[PDB]
Structure 1
């Protein structure tokens, strides 16, 4: 299952192949416009390209990078905690990991695995992509 390319241009569309990165992106999007978030996301991933590196990071460094986005202190600790649990803890779904609620977990289930028909998002932009799928899904291949 490989997600199609929508006009909405969600960042999840290019991060489906890396569940960790996709979920990091969701956290960056927590009450934060992707207009400011996405650029900082690339600066972040360039510094911490994996969960093995992210868990071993010092949060004061990350919050420094997250400063212009707001929610910098809590996210930094969340990102580190989430990264550790993403590796250490045995999950079957990311919601069980700290910092990931329904939105992040619905993103994982639409993009990282094929459960998108079993997914009913409450998020705005996730509903739009989900709708754009249903109409065009048969014109592609999926079912």
Structure 2
């Protein structure tokens, strides 16, 4: 279980559900966290699981993502990612549609106990990881 930290990372609240944590990383991509977080709550209220998100009509998701931008791109990504999350045989989420380095590094630091094996590039994640190494 990740310890108490001076950091403001949405991953620290979402880590028990890998899917929600990964969805947050999709919301945060090329988007202001100020915008992305309140919209992520609206999304999670309507789609609280991959089970329902994979059955969603991406155009419904898109309408919700409108003020964040990349709404069609991210809506189609979310639906497809959610389907792969439950149906593909994955060990690391980098194998899944729409997930890259950011989501993968977040998963290995927060959902699994592999923070030592990770080289984060995201500014906050990198400082958080520096704090783990310092306080190990």
What's the TM-score once normalised by structure 2's chain length?
Answer: 0.97
Counterpart in 2 of 1:40? 39
Structure 1 stretch displaced more, 121-130 or 104-113? 121-130
**Structure 1 residue ranges without an equivalent (≥5):** 138-143
1:21-74: per-residue Cα shift (whole Å, max 9, x none)? 000000000011111100000000000001010000001111101000000000
CA distance in 1 between partners of 2:127 and 2:74 (Å): 26
CA distance in 2, matches of 1:68, 1:136: 39
Q: Deviations over 1:81-132 (max 9, x none)?
A: 0000000111011000000001110000000000001111122111011011
- In structure 2, the residue matched to 1:58 is 57
Distance in 1, matches of 2:120 and 2:133, equals: 14
Aligned residues: 136
**After TM superposition, which residue ranges in structure 1, 4 or more long, deviate above 3 angstroms?**
none
Higher mean C-alpha deviation, range 71-80 or range 115-124: 115-124
Structure 1 CA distance, aligned partners of 2:4 and 2:100? Answer: 25
TM-score (norm 1): 0.93
In the alignment, the residues of structure 1 paired with residue 6 and residue 58 of structure 2 have an alpha-carbon distance, to the nearest angstrom, of 35
Deviates more, 1:117-126 or 1:44-53: 117-126
Structure 2 segments unaligned to the other structure (5+ residues): none
In structure 1, distance between residues paired with 2:24 and 2:79? 14
Alpha-carbon distance in structure 2 between the residues aligned to 1:5 and 1:54: 30
